[PDB]
C-alpha cells in the first residue's frame, strides 16, 4: 500500500483520472480547431493561434492533475482518447460556440469533483481545484462569451468582412 | 466660529456641498456605464475603459471640491447619493449621448457656482473653478461630441460593425 | 438568457449586488471621516490620510465584486447610497471605533455571503471571497484594534497630547 | 472581551494552541534528528542539513499559527514541550520513516482543525490552513516518500555504500 | 478542390494523417512513462524528466506534420488515440527497451512514408522527412541504445544501486 | 567509545546538555513574551520585535552549544522543555524585568560551566564560552538595564504615554 497516501479516497482518485482524460480530449479538440483555421481555404491565423494556445493550456491542466495524483499517492491510469466531435468546424462563431460548450463541460466536471471532495472531506483537493482550475475556467469562459458577442455583432452586419475584422483586430 | 474663514459666503459653502453631490452622482453613473459595457452580452472593452476612467475623474473632482471647502473654512456636508438614471445603457451612441447630457449638467452647475461667486465677490472661488473645472469640462464635452459624430457616422452605415470598429480604432 | 452563466444562483447574484452597495457606502463613510480630519479645527493629517486610503480600498473592493458579477454572468444593479451615519466624527478614538464597527459589519456580510455560497455549492464564490476579502478584513480589523489600544492608552494619559503623538508617530 | 474577535470559536482557539504545541514538538524532534547526523560516528552532513532545515520550517509554522491566533483575537497559551521520542535515530531509512510518521501526524492534525473550522462555519481558518499548511504538507510528504524509496533501493543493495551515495548525490 | 495542392497524392495525404496518429500515440506513451517514474514508489526524477521531454518532442513532431499537411493542401483528419500499451512500466531498463521499440516503430513509419513519396515522385515530402524527422530519429535511437547499454551494465552489477546511479549521473 | 573525544569530561558533557535546555527554555519564554505584545489589546510592536529577536538569538545559542558538543565527541541529550513562567506578561517594565531575571540566570549558568571547565582543566570549553556567550550576555544585560531605566523614568511620569513613547522612540 502507498507510504504517503492520506485522506485520499478511491472515489477522488478515479475521478481525477477521468478528469485527465477530459482535459486531454479537450486538448485534442483544440488541436483540431487550430489546424482547421490554418487551412488555406479558411485562413484565419488569429483564430488558429487562439485555439492552438488553448490546446497547450489544456495539456498543462492534464499535467497538473497528474502531478497532483502522484503527490497524493494515487495512481494515474490512462484511457483511450476519443477523437474530436467534428472534422470541420464551420465559421468563427460556430467554432467559438463549440469552445464554450467544451469549457462548460470541463467546468461542470471540476464542480462535480469539488463536490465529491467536499463529501469526502478532502480539503487539499478542494484548494487545488479552486487555486488552479476554477478561476481559470471562469475567466476563460467570460473571454469566450465576450468574443462570441463580438463575432455575432460583426457577422450579423456582413459575414465575410466581419470574420476578417475580428481576426485582425481582436485576435 | 472658523479661525481661517474669510470672504467665504454661506451661499457658496452650500453650493459647493451640492456640487460635490453632483460629482459623486456622476462618478456613480460612470461606474454603472462602465460595468454595463463589461457584460459578456455587450462586450465593448474600450467603451468600458472610457467610462471607468471618467468615474475616476469625477471622484477626483469631488475630492478637489472637498479640499477647497476645508481650505476656505467651510464644512463638508454629505447627502444621500441617488442611483444612476438607468440600469442598462443601450448601444454606444445611447451611452455617449447620456454622457454628454451628464457633463452639460455638471458644466451648468459650475457656471451657476461661478456666477454666485461673482455676485458674492469671491475671486478665489472664481479662479479655482476656472483653473480646475471649466476648461476640463469644455475639453471633455468636445471629445464626447467628436466621439458621438464618429459613432453616428459609423452606425448609420452598419450598426454592429460600426460599433465594433469605433471601439477598436478610436477607444 | 446568459451564454456564460453556470452554477451561479439568483440568490448569490442579488447578495453580491447588496454587498457592492455596502462597500460603496463604506467608501463614502471613509471619504467623510477623511475630510473631517482635514478640517482646520481638527487638523490631524495622518488620520485624514488613513481614512482617505481606506475610502480607496473599499472602492477597489466594490470594483472587484462588480468584475466578478460580470465574470459569472450576473447583472450589476445599483441602489441609492445612503449618506454616512455622522456629519462630525469626534476625536481619533471615536473615529477608530466607528471604523471597527464598519469593518465588522462588512466582515459579517462577507461571512454571510460565504455561507450562502456554501449552501448553494458555489466553490468559485467561496474561493473568490477567501482570496480577496476575508483575509484583508481580518488584517485590517487587527490593525484597527492595535490602533485603538494605542490611542486609548495615549488619551487616557493626556488627551490632546496623546492624540497628537499618535498621529505623528504611528500614522 | 476582545474588541476584534468575530466568528472565532473557543473550540478553534484551543485547537490552534494545541497545533502550535505539535509544531514546536516537531521542530524539537527535527533539531534532535539533525544533530544526531552531525555526530562524528554518524557523519552524514546532507542528512543533518535536511533535518535542521525542517526544524526551522516547523518553527516558522508555529509562528504563523501564533500570528493568526492574535489576528483573530484569540489568546496564545503555551504548554510544556515533550522531548523527542528517541535519543538516537538509527540509519537514514529509520530517520526518514520517523519523519514521515511525524508529518502524517501533523497533516492529520491540520485536517482535523480544518474539519472543526468547517463545522464552526469559519472560512477564514479554512483558507488560512489551505493556503499555508495543507499543500506544504502534501509536498513535503511526497518528497519524503521519494527519498525513502531511493534510500531503500540503495541500502537493499549495499547498506553503507548506499547511505553514503544518497547523502552525497540527493541531499 | 484545393487552390494550392500540387503533386500531393491522396496516398501521401492519408499516410501523413496516420503518421500524426502514431506521433500523438507516442506522445501519450511518453506522458505515461514519465508520470510512472514520478510515483513515490518509483521516484526516479531524471527518468521522469527524460520521458516527459520526449512526450513534448513527439507532440512537436505531430504539429510539424500537421503544418505540412496544410502547406501542401491536404486535410488533417484525426482518429481515436489508443491508450499506452502498459499501465506500469517496470524498471529503468524495461522502460528504455520499450522506448526503443516505440522509436523503431516511428522510424519504420517514416521510412515507409519516404518510400511512398519516392514512388509518388514527391520530392518535397522526401526533403521534409529527411530534414526534420529521419536524422532526429537516428540520433535519438543511438542515445537510447547508449543509455540501455549503460543501464544494463549497471544493473547487472547491483540492480537498485545501479538504477540510482544512472539516474543521478547520466540523466 | 568516541574516536575524537579528548580532555572532555562527562561532567562538562552533562552540563552542556543542561545549558542547551536552559537556552531552549529561554527561547520559548521570549516567543511567549513576543506574542503577548502582539495582542490587539497590548499592541506594542517594537516590544514584540525586541523579544521575538531574542527568541531567535537564544535558539542560535542552543545550536552553537550543540555543534560544540558534537565537535568535542559528547552526546546531545534532550529533555522536556518547561513552558514559560507566565501566560501574560503585564506592562513593558514587568516584561523587561522578567527578561533581566532570565538573562542573569543564563549568565550564572555560563559562569558555573566556566568554573567547571576550569576545575576540569578544559581550556577549549573556557575559550568557547568566553568567545561566544559571556560577552554577549554582559552586552545584552547592559542594554536591558538601560532600557529598564528609560521605561521606568517614562512610566513614572505618565504610564500609558510613557510606554508608547519608549516603544516608538527607542525600540
Swiss-Prot record, chains A, B, C, D, E, F:
Compartments reported by the entry: Cytoplasmic vesicle, Autophagosome; Cytoplasm; Autolysosome
Transmembrane segments: none
Biological process, per Gene Ontology: intracellular iron ion homeostasis; iron ion transport
GO cellular component: autolysosome; autophagosome; cytoplasm; cytoplasmic vesicle; ferritin complex
Cross-referenced SUPFAM superfamilies: Ferritin-like (SSF47240)
Ferritin-like diiron domain span: 6-155
GO MF annotation: an example: ferrous iron binding
Entry keyword set: Acetylation, Cytoplasm, Cytoplasmic vesicle, Iron, Iron storage, Lysosome, Metal-binding
Annotated binding of Fe cation, by residue: 53, 56-57, 60, 63
Stretches for region Catalytic site for iron oxidation: 53-60
One Pfam family named in its UniProt record: Ferritin
N-acetylserine: modified positions: 1
InterPro entries associated with the record: Ferritin, Ferritin-like, Ferritin-like_diiron, Ferritin-like_SF, Ferritin_CS, Ferritin_DPS_dom
Comment field (misc): In horse spleen the light chain is the major chain.
Protein family membership: Belongs to the ferritin family.
Purpose: Stores iron in a soluble, non-toxic, readily available form. Important for iron homeostasis. Iron is taken up in the ferrous form and deposited as ferric hydroxides after oxidation. Also plays a role in delivery of iron to cells. Mediates iron uptake in capsule cells of the developing kidney. Delivery to lysosomes by the cargo receptor NCOA4 for autophagic degradation and release or iron.
Oligomeric and partner information: Oligomer of 24 subunits. There are two types of subunits: L (light) chain and H (heavy) chain. The major chain can be light or heavy, depending on the species and tissue type. The functional molecule forms a roughly spherical shell with a diameter of 12 nm and contains a central cavity into which the insoluble mineral iron core is deposited. Interacts with NCOA4.
Name under which the protein is recorded: Ferritin light chain
Source organism per UniProt: Equus caballus
Species lineage: Eukaryota, Metazoa, Chordata, Craniata, Vertebrata
Gene of this entry: FTL
Amino acid at each position: 500500500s502507498s507510504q504517503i497516501r492520506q485522506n485520499y479516497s478511491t472515489e477522488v482518485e478515479a475521478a481525477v483520472n477521468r478528469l485527465v482524460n477530459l482535459y486531454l480530449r479537450a486538448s485534442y479538440t483544440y488541436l483540431s480547431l487550430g489546424f482547421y483555421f490554418d487551412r488555406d481555404d479558411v485562413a484565419l491565423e488569429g483564430v488558429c493561434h487562439f485555439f492552438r494556445e488553448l490546446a497547450e493550456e489544456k495539456m498543462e491542466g492534464a499535467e497538473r492533475l497528474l502531478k497532483m495524483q502522484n503527490q497524493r499517492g494515487g495512481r494515474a491510469l490512462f484511457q483511450d482518447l476519443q477523437k474530436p466531435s467534428q472534422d470541420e468546424w464551420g465559421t468563427t462563431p460556430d467554432a467559438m460556440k463549440a469552445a464554450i460548450v467544451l469549457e462548460k463541460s470541463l467546468n461542470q466536471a471540476l464542480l462535480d469533483l469539488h463536490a465529491l471532495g467536499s463529501a469526502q472531506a478532502d480539503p487539499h483537493l478542494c484548494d487545488f481545484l479552486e487555486s488552479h482550475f476554477l478561476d481559470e475556467e471562469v475567466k476563460l469562459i467570460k473571454k469566450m462569451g465576450d468574443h462570441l458577442t463580438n463575432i455575432q455583432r460583426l457577422v450579423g452586419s456582413q459575414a465575410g468582412l466581419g470574420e476578417y475584422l475580428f481576426e485582425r483586430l481582436t485576435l
